[PDB]
Amino acid sequence: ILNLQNNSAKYNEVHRASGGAIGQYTTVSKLKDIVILTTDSLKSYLLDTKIANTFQIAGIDFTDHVISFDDLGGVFKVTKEFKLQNQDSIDFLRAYGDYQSQ
Protein backbone atom coordinates (compact mmCIF):
# COMPACT_ATOMS: atom_id res chain seq x y z
CA ILE A 1 0.00 0.00 0.00
CA LEU A 2 1.22 3.46 -1.12
CA ASN A 3 3.14 1.83 -3.83
CA LEU A 4 -0.31 2.02 -5.38
CA GLN A 5 -0.81 5.77 -5.06
CA ASN A 6 2.26 6.66 -7.09
CA ASN A 7 2.04 7.41 -10.80
CA SER A 8 3.28 4.09 -12.13
CA ALA A 9 2.79 1.79 -15.08
CA LYS A 10 4.23 -1.26 -13.35
CA TYR A 11 1.18 -2.26 -11.36
CA ASN A 12 -1.46 -2.88 -14.01
CA GLU A 13 -1.33 -5.72 -16.50
CA VAL A 14 -2.52 -3.97 -19.66
CA HIS A 15 -0.01 -5.97 -21.74
CA ARG A 16 -2.54 -8.81 -21.66
CA ALA A 17 -5.12 -6.63 -23.41
CA SER A 18 -5.90 -7.02 -27.08
CA GLY A 19 -4.55 -3.88 -28.68
CA GLY A 20 -2.14 -2.99 -25.90
CA ALA A 21 0.43 -5.77 -25.80
CA ILE A 22 3.53 -3.56 -25.91
CA GLY A 23 3.69 -0.10 -24.42
CA GLN A 24 2.83 1.14 -20.96
CA TYR A 25 -0.12 2.65 -19.10
CA THR A 26 0.00 4.61 -15.85
CA THR A 27 -2.76 4.68 -13.25
CA VAL A 28 -3.23 5.36 -9.54
CA SER A 29 -5.73 4.68 -6.77
CA LYS A 30 -7.45 6.64 -4.06
CA LEU A 31 -7.60 4.55 -0.77
CA LYS A 32 -11.38 4.46 -1.09
CA ASP A 33 -10.74 1.75 -3.64
CA ILE A 34 -7.90 -0.53 -2.47
CA VAL A 35 -8.79 -3.77 -0.77
CA ILE A 36 -6.44 -6.58 0.08
CA LEU A 37 -7.19 -10.28 -0.03
CA THR A 38 -5.51 -12.65 2.35
CA THR A 39 -6.02 -15.67 4.49
CA ASP A 40 -7.16 -15.34 8.07
CA SER A 41 -3.86 -16.40 9.65
CA LEU A 42 -1.81 -13.34 8.83
CA LYS A 43 -4.94 -11.27 9.28
CA SER A 44 -4.71 -12.39 12.90
CA TYR A 45 -0.98 -11.67 12.77
CA LEU A 46 -1.91 -8.11 11.85
CA LEU A 47 -4.52 -8.09 14.61
CA ASP A 48 -2.04 -8.85 17.37
CA THR A 49 1.48 -7.95 16.31
CA LYS A 50 1.21 -4.87 14.13
CA ILE A 51 -1.62 -3.24 16.04
CA ALA A 52 -1.07 -4.11 19.70
CA ASN A 53 2.72 -4.07 19.95
CA THR A 54 2.76 -0.81 17.99
CA PHE A 55 2.52 1.99 20.53
CA GLN A 56 1.23 4.69 18.18
CA ILE A 57 -1.32 3.28 15.83
CA ALA A 58 -3.94 5.98 15.45
CA GLY A 59 -3.50 6.57 11.73
CA ILE A 60 -1.88 3.39 10.51
CA ASP A 61 -4.43 0.64 11.27
CA PHE A 62 -5.33 -0.44 7.74
CA THR A 63 -7.30 -3.53 8.86
CA ASP A 64 -10.42 -1.75 7.63
CA HIS A 65 -9.39 -2.75 4.08
CA VAL A 66 -8.88 -6.44 4.89
CA ILE A 67 -11.06 -9.35 3.93
CA SER A 68 -9.91 -12.87 4.66
CA PHE A 69 -11.02 -16.47 4.32
CA ASP A 70 -10.41 -19.86 5.89
CA ASP A 71 -8.72 -21.39 2.89
CA LEU A 72 -7.93 -19.75 -0.41
CA GLY A 73 -8.45 -22.98 -2.27
CA GLY A 74 -11.51 -25.19 -2.15
CA VAL A 75 -12.28 -25.29 -5.84
CA PHE A 76 -11.12 -27.25 -8.84
CA LYS A 77 -10.39 -26.43 -12.46
CA VAL A 78 -10.07 -28.76 -15.47
CA THR A 79 -7.08 -28.93 -17.79
CA LYS A 80 -7.87 -31.80 -20.17
CA GLU A 81 -11.38 -32.15 -21.56
CA PHE A 82 -12.66 -35.61 -20.72
CA LYS A 83 -15.72 -37.80 -20.35
CA LEU A 84 -17.55 -39.52 -17.49
CA GLN A 85 -17.37 -43.31 -17.28
CA ASN A 86 -17.81 -44.42 -13.66
CA GLN A 87 -21.03 -44.95 -11.75
CA ASP A 88 -19.68 -43.82 -8.38
CA SER A 89 -18.72 -40.58 -10.11
CA ILE A 90 -22.40 -40.10 -10.93
CA ASP A 91 -23.29 -40.96 -7.34
CA PHE A 92 -20.75 -38.51 -5.96
CA LEU A 93 -21.84 -35.73 -8.28
CA ARG A 94 -25.52 -36.06 -7.49
CA ALA A 95 -24.51 -36.21 -3.85
CA TYR A 96 -23.94 -32.46 -4.34
CA GLY A 97 -27.04 -31.85 -6.44
CA ASP A 98 -25.68 -32.49 -9.95
CA TYR A 99 -28.59 -34.63 -11.04
CA GLN A 100 -28.40 -34.03 -14.77
CA SER A 101 -24.95 -35.48 -15.46
CA GLN A 102 -24.89 -38.95 -17.00
Binding site: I1, L2, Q5, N6, N7, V28, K30, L31, K32, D33, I34, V35, I57, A58, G59, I60, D61, F62, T63, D64, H65, I67
Partner: peptide
Protein backbone atom coordinates in the same frame (compact mmCIF):
# COMPACT_ATOMS: atom_id res chain seq x y z
CA UNK B 1 -1.48 20.84 -14.42
CA UNK B 2 -2.58 19.04 -11.24
CA UNK B 3 -6.27 19.18 -10.44
CA UNK B 4 -6.89 16.13 -8.28
CA UNK B 5 -4.56 16.18 -5.36
CA UNK B 6 -1.69 13.74 -5.05
CA UNK B 7 0.46 13.72 -1.87
CA UNK B 8 -2.24 15.47 0.17
CA UNK B 9 -5.59 13.98 -0.81
CA UNK B 10 -3.56 10.98 -1.93
CA UNK B 11 -0.35 9.22 -0.81
CA UNK B 12 -1.94 8.87 2.60
CA UNK B 13 -1.92 5.94 4.94
CA UNK B 14 -1.96 8.18 8.04
CA UNK B 15 -5.78 7.90 7.95
CA UNK B 16 -7.33 4.64 9.19
CA UNK B 17 -7.84 3.37 12.64
CA UNK B 18 -11.40 2.22 13.14
CA UNK B 19 -12.15 -1.42 13.77
CA UNK B 20 -14.56 -1.82 10.88
CA UNK B 21 -15.13 -2.97 7.29
CA UNK B 22 -16.55 -1.76 3.90
CA UNK B 23 -14.39 0.77 2.19
CA UNK B 24 -15.64 -1.19 -0.80
CA UNK B 25 -17.47 1.42 -2.86
CA UNK B 26 -17.66 0.28 -6.46
CA UNK B 27 -18.26 3.69 -7.97
CA UNK B 28 -20.30 4.29 -11.10
CA UNK B 29 -18.71 4.78 -14.49
CA UNK B 30 -18.57 7.32 -17.31
Amino acid sequence: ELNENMSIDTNKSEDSYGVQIHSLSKQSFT
